[PDB]
Amino acid sequence: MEIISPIITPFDKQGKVNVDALKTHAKNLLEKGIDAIFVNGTTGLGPALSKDEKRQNLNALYDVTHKLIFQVGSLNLNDVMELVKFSNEMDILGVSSHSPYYFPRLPEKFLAKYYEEIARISSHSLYIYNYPAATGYDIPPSILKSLPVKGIKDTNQDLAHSLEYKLNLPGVKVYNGSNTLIYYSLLSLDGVVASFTNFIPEVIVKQRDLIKQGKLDDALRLQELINRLADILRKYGSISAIYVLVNEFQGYDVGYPRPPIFPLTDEEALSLKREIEPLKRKIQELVH
Amino acid sequence: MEIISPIITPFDKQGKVNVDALKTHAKNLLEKGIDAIFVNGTTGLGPALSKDEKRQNLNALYDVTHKLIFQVGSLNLNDVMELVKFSNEMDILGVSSHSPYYFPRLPEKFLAKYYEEIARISSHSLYIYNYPAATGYDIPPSILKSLPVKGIKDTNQDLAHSLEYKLNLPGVKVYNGSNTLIYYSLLSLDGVVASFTNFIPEVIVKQRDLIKQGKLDDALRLQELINRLADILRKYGSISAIYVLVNEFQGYDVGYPRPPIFPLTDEEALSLKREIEPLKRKIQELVH
Amino acid sequence: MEIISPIITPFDKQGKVNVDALKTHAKNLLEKGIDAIFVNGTTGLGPALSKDEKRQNLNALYDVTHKLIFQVGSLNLNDVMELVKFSNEMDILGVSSHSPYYFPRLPEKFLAKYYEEIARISSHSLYIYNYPAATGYDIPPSILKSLPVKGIKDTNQDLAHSLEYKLNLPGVKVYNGSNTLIYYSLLSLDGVVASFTNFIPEVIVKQRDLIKQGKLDDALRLQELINRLADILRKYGSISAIYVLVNEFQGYDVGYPRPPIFPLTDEEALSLKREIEPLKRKIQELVH
Amino acid sequence: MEIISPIITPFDKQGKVNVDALKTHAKNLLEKGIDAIFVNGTTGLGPALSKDEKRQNLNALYDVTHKLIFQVGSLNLNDVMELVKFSNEMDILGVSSHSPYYFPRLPEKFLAKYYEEIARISSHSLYIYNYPAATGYDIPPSILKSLPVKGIKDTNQDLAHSLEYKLNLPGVKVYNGSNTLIYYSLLSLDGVVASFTNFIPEVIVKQRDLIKQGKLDDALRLQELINRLADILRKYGSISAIYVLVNEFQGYDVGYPRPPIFPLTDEEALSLKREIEPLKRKIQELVH
Ligand SMILES: [Mg+2]
Ligand SMILES: [Mg+2]
């Protein structure tokens, strides 16, 4: 069971990426048991990052670790290919992309052709990122059987959906991307890519270790606390809340998200910290 | 009753915008009776265009006409503001943006703050572009009541939703963005922003003229044909099919869309042309 | 253009149908221009009515008028067939049914077989009632082309959907069932089946007469008022509000709906009447 | 961990319930390790059953066991209350209902008042049946906090939604109603109400026993097979297919479903049996 972190991209107040904070953050996550870093994913504001910002994120993280999966998706296949060619010359775990997005009603063959082009040029293992609620498309096994897929990150609240890949794609590693299903993924799939690893990494690593010891009740209790947090964060914007919580739980500044993913105001951040306080104590009591 | 065209962005085989073809195309549309041009819209591949590409489209079109609505949306508010400051220097119809997109579950206040920032800096009338099927969000009238909105392009199959803006926002011009509801829009709203104006402009202009003469049956008859076209185009990818039809119907080359919006292959194009031929005859018979 | 009323079913406080009020209500609607009555439809609580209640509704109304379309749907085809055989012996306009409901994931052939059985035994014209938001199924033309369909009531906010039937089913009468699209239906389809005819029949008949005279602006203004009413009624329960409004606008008691379609409390009914007052005056000013 | 069966209602060729087959079937299920029976559920054709039919199913089953959850829902609260008063006289596990259905856009208070009325008159523990895909409504925990709820059957593919009830309603027993999530439910909730218990009860009982022994891999392996079955059944109509499989797997005839839930033709049945045969072998090999 692997615990992969879709790392956040720290920005300063002017909306410029702070690579020092990114490296400090990554080192800490890795020291605490995180198995790999998914760069430029949804939590990392991937689609909001320019071609060069995606590249600079990889370069910065490449000075810290080799355990990197590079997400390269954009709405111009020329730019995507430029990022694949760039990453070919580096020693990373894999290259990834979510499907074409924004435009509705694109024929399925477009999705297929998109991935075939990435597969044709990449010299790295291919990780399909399936996120229907975000892109508007569900990549079906029909298209995946044709491609050299190594792993799939499936963001879907229906575990049966993630499990269907495991069955139809022999040998492919499947990871579910929801924080609210970690316990179930750790008992049925190859791991998880969970946004919450950004601020409670020790908690998620503890879940896997408890499950490895056969202590499921304990792992389920941690999951219940996680699901309560997730429920509180919705009203503030889950990604935006994460920045405040990393500082709260981990003790270092990771800056702010970049608008339209607006940062929490001072009041919102103070309000958030009050709501989560009881969950904090209870989590630190079970994980120390 | 205004007939607005979301003009396509001509690209060459390498994916570079061809601004000469953009000008030739826009000029023909105006001569055929199109009243204004929505620049960098969905049909124009807006979200897939870089900041610079969006700017050059506006510069190019400005030479042809000033009846331009400048769509500037992106997932980095700083780039949006940069385009707004740039357009403040020019004499145009207005500035527009669709809502933030991709990221699901963003709080409503985020959408409000995004539009507030455009308004704060813009010296042009604001045109709100609502396309829930694409962005994942519906901009309710409640958010628009505080902004200096002059126009709303509403791409929604429910005409009552478009009429709702009319009712709740006095003095605001509302245009529906669906090709399949043109007839109804010309009988209730302030106009239409229909992608089919790119290849059958004279048909849509003829519908308005027939309606103004009281010949609704004839206009409705033209709508039936338009809706049959829409069904055929879906299979090929509507935007991609438009590039092929512009050449067919108008006589000049507007190039290709840019992948992930894949161009039709020569086989596909020839297949499309045969399939729409009977409809093309019925069209060119009712619209001399 | 026909104006069909999906008549409400009056109940007393004990949940028993009051046929005298039903007849009084029907006479008034017919005197005011309503062209036909759709019995046991959604507004008439069809699926909540027992086999015998559906039969008694038809018998009672049959003492008032011959212009009746009899909706007979239930989750036991034996009961549906018993109602079709019963109605065969009476002189009415047609027999109707919405699709199988409740159970999700039923194969399309089930819908087909359901209607084929009704078509096999009925000696009356068949009216398909398509209401996807209620049944969970959209009956596609594929199945309708095989059946002897005379008319279709399409409840869908997408007029292009209702218009698609007109085009694919030559000779079939198509009526849209939304109060918020009446104006558009009266300008493109064969009529409407609108719940609001229960309390503002003169208003809807006036819309058609105005459109018949070419006075579209006037007909659109009436539509704007209708859409404002619809928006106010949602919070109370549209069907439940109708009972109170029939009494308000028409001057006779039609009783109450039957739980789970709960009646408005005294306070709710008083609150409703206050909200609609301005719309009343403005409607009675334009229709007297 | 409770394994509950939503028992099918056996009908003869004419559509009359066969209570002898209902008893034979229930007895076999108990002997194979099923713990309780959910009577008149979706799989039991609840909504399609008349008030009297729902009552006779309970009377019949009562002779076999008292571990009965009596589903009483209908679109006439008076009939619901009549069934509740009747069941108050009997010694059963509890009384249940799914929410009001068909009618869309009912206010939330209507759903609350419906359940309040059942609670006011019932002398048995209340089991809330949540099936949004069928009824069109999701019963939130907020409505349940005031009622004396003892159990919740949640048919939802999102396990976090089922876990949410656990977290927000202390002391309430929660069971997930999906065949494709059985494994996960047996590792986190209080049990399952799975329709496949009708034909592969020993498989589901074996999953629980394997889990209790710590053999998760074996239980997960059985889930894969179950999920492959679910895919095959969809095409034929899941409920209808179950009647054919009960005879196949268990050796006695449980008749036919009742139209609109059409029985499989002899050709369809023979086609189903061939398609599931390979899976049946893998099943009967891991479950001696
Ligand atoms: Mg370096
Ligand atoms: Mg009589």
CATH, residue A232: 3.20.20.70
CA distance B243 to B21: 12
Q: Please classify residue C189 by burial: count the beta carbons closer than 10 Å to its beta carbon, then call 0-12 exposed, 13-18 middle and 19+ buried.
A: buried
| Smallest Cα distance from B129 to chain C, Å | 20
Phi-psi region of A256 (alpha: psi -120 to 50; beta: other; left: phi over 0): beta
A54 is in an annotated binding site: no
Q: Please classify residue B233 by burial: count the beta carbons closer than 10 Å to its beta carbon, then call 0-12 exposed, 13-18 middle and 19+ buried.
A: buried
Range list of β-strands (E), chain C: 2-6, 36-39, 68-71, 94-98, 126-130, 149-154, 173-176, 191-193
User: By C-alpha distance, which of C14, C9, C1, C64 is closest to C195?
Assistant: C9
| Amino acid, single-letter form, for residue B129 | Y
For chain D, what is the radius of gyration of the CA atoms? 18
Where b means 16+ CB within 10 Å and e means fewer, D123-137 reads: ebbbbbbbbbebbbb
Q: Please classify residue B89 by burial: count the beta carbons closer than 10 Å to its beta carbon, then call 0-12 exposed, 13-18 middle and 19+ buried.
A: exposed
How many structural domains does chain B have? 1
Long-range CB pairs of C176-179 (<8 Å, 24+ gap) are C177/C6, C177/C131, C177/C153, C178/B160, C179/C226, C179/C227, C179/C230
Q: Taking CB atoms and an 8 Å limit, are D78 and C237 in contact across chains?
A: no
Q: Which residues contact A95 (CB under 8 A, 6 or more apart)?
A: A69, A70, A72, A84, A87, A118, A122, A124, A125, A126, A127
| Amino acid, single-letter form, for residue B183 | Y
CA distance C22 to A201: 67
CA distance A261 to A170: 38
Number of B/C CB contacts below 8 angstroms equals: 57
CA distance C209 to D183: 64
Strands D94-98 and D68-71: parallel
Sequence-ordered alpha helix ranges (H) in chain D: 19-31, 51-62, 77-88, 108-121, 132-135, 141-144, 159-168, 182-185, 201-212, 216-234, 238-250, 266-286
What is the DSSP annotation of A207-272? HHHHHHTT-HHHHHHHHHHHHHHHHHHGGG-HHHHHHHHHHHHHSS---B--TTSPPPPHHHHHHH
> Which residues of B are known catalytic residues?
153
Q: Please classify residue D218 by burial: count the beta carbons closer than 10 Å to its beta carbon, then call 0-12 exposed, 13-18 middle and 19+ buried.
A: middle
CA distance A120 to A129: 18
Q: Taking CB atoms and an 8 Å limit, are B234 and A262 in contact across chains?
A: no
CA of A49 to the centre of ligand 1 (A): 20
**A197 contacts A223 by C-beta, under 8 angstroms:** no
Where b means 16+ CB within 10 Å and e means fewer, D13-24 reads: eebebbbebbeb
Q: Taking CB atoms and an 8 Å limit, are B237 and A107 in contact across chains?
A: yes
D130 is in an annotated binding site: yes
Q: Which residues contact D212 (CB under 8 A, 6 or more apart)?
A: D1
Long-range CB pairs of A243-251 (<8 Å, 24+ gap) are A243/A8, A243/A10, A244/A269, A244/A272, A244/A273, A245/A198, A245/A199, A245/A272, A245/A276, A246/A8, A246/A25, A246/A198, A246/A199, A248/A199, A248/A273, A248/A276, A248/A280, A249/A199, A249/A200, A249/A280, A250/A25, A250/A28, A250/A199
Detail the residues of C annotated as belonging to a binding site.
42-43, 129-131, 153-155
**CA D193 to mean position of chain CA atoms:** 5
User: Residue D266's domain spans which residues?
Assistant: 1-288
CA distance C110 to D261: 7
The DSSP letter of residue B17 is: B
User: By C-alpha distance, which of C120, C174, C215, C184 is closest to C4?
Assistant: C174
State the ligand closest to the CA atom of C23. Answer: 2
Q: Taking CB atoms and an 8 Å limit, are D75 and C101 in contact across chains?
A: no
Mutate to test the interface with D, among C99, C102, C121, C264 (most CBs of D within 10 A): C102
User: Which residues on neighbouring strands pair with residue B17, listed in sequence order?
Assistant: B11
Among the listed residues C32, C54, C150, C153, the single catalytic one is: C153
Q: Taking CB atoms and an 8 Å limit, are C184 and B184 in contact across chains?
A: yes
| Smallest Cα distance from B51 to chain A, Å | 10
CA distance A51 to D220: 42
For chain C, what is the radius of gyration of the CA atoms? 18
CA distance B106 to B97: 17
**D90 contacts D58 by C-beta, under 8 angstroms:** yes
List C-alpha distances in Å: A98 to A51, A111, A132, A175: 15, 10, 9, 14
A265 is in an annotated binding site: no
**C61 contacts C97 by C-beta, under 8 angstroms:** no
Pick B167's closest partner by Cβ from C158, C164, C228: C228
CA distance C60 to A239: 62
In 3-state terms, what secondary structure has residue B94?
strand
A65 is in an annotated binding site: no
Contact list, D212 vs chain A (CB under 8 Å): none
CA distance C62 to D28: 52
Q: Taking CB atoms and an 8 Å limit, are A183 and D188 in contact across chains?
A: yes
| Smallest Cα distance from C170 to chain B, Å | 13
Strands D36-39 and D68-71: parallel
Mutual orientation of helices D19-31 and D238-250 as an angle, nearest 10°?
70
Count other C-beta atoms under 10 Å from residue B138's C-beta: 14
Interface list for chain A against chain D, based on CB atoms closer than 8 Å: 157-161, 163-164, 166-167, 178, 180-181, 183-184, 187-188, 214, 216, 220, 223-224, 227-228, 231
CA distance D225 to C202: 62
Q: Report cis status (omega within 30 of 0) of the bond before C260.
A: yes
Contact list, B223 vs chain C (CB under 8 Å): 163
CA of A63 to the centre of ligand 1 (A): 5
Q: Which residue has the tokens 């099918």?
A: D8
Examine chains D and C and say if they touch (3+ CB pairs below 8 A). Answer: yes
State the structure-solving technique: X-ray
List C-alpha distances in Å: D95 to C147, D25, D85, D124: 42, 21, 11, 6
Pick C158's closest partner by Cβ from B157, B164, B228: B157
> Which residues of A are known catalytic residues?
153
Contact list, D228 vs chain A (CB under 8 Å): 167
Mutate to test the interface with B, among A12, A75, A99, A265 (most CBs of B within 10 A): A75
Count other C-beta atoms under 10 Å from residue B232's C-beta: 14
B236 is in an annotated binding site: no
State the ligand closest to the CA atom of C58. Answer: 2
Where b means 16+ CB within 10 Å and e means fewer, A19-44 reads: bebbbbbbeebbebebbbbbbbbbbb
Contact list, A117 vs chain B (CB under 8 Å): 259
* CA A233-A238-A241 angle, 5° bins: 75
The DSSP letter of residue D17 is: B
What resolution does the deposited structure have, in angstroms? Answer: 2.5
User: By C-alpha distance, which of B282, B276, B246 is closest to B32?
Assistant: B246
The DSSP letter of residue C219 is: H
CA distance B77 to B129: 16
**What's phi and psi for A232, nearest 5 deg?**
-75, -40
State the ligand closest to the CA atom of C91. Answer: 2
Mutate to test the interface with D, among C8, C13, C45, C103 (most CBs of D within 10 A): C103
> From D226, which residue of chain A is nearest by alpha-carbon distance?
A160
> From B133, which residue of chain A is nearest by alpha-carbon distance?
A104
**CA D43 to mean position of chain CA atoms:** 6
CA trace torsion B152, B153, B156, B159 (10° rounding): 60
Contact list, A228 vs chain D (CB under 8 Å): 167
User: By C-alpha distance, which of C40, C153, C135, C106 is closest to D260?
Assistant: C106
Pick A105's closest partner by Cβ from B48, B77, B234: B234
Q: Taking CB atoms and an 8 Å limit, are B160 and C167 in contact across chains?
A: no
Examine chains A and C and say if they touch (3+ CB pairs below 8 A). Answer: no
The DSSP letter of residue D268 is: H
Q: Which residues contact A124 (CB under 8 A, 6 or more apart)?
A: A70, A87, A88, A92, A93, A94, A95
CA of A29 to the centre of ligand 1 (A): 19
CA distance A212 to C92: 72
Q: Give the pair of three-digit tokens for residue A149.
A: 């897929």
What is the DSSP annotation of C94-130? EEEEEPP-S--S--HHHHHHHHHHHHHH--S-EEEEE
Q: Taking CB atoms and an 8 Å limit, are A47 and B103 in contact across chains?
A: yes
DSSP percent split of chain C into helix, strand, coil, nearest 5: 50, 15, 35
Length of chain C: 288
Contact list, B77 vs chain A (CB under 8 Å): 15, 258-260
Number of H helices, E strands in chain D: 12, 8
Q: Taking CB atoms and an 8 Å limit, are B227 and C167 in contact across chains?
A: yes
Residue A171 CA neighbour count, 13 Å, CB half: 6
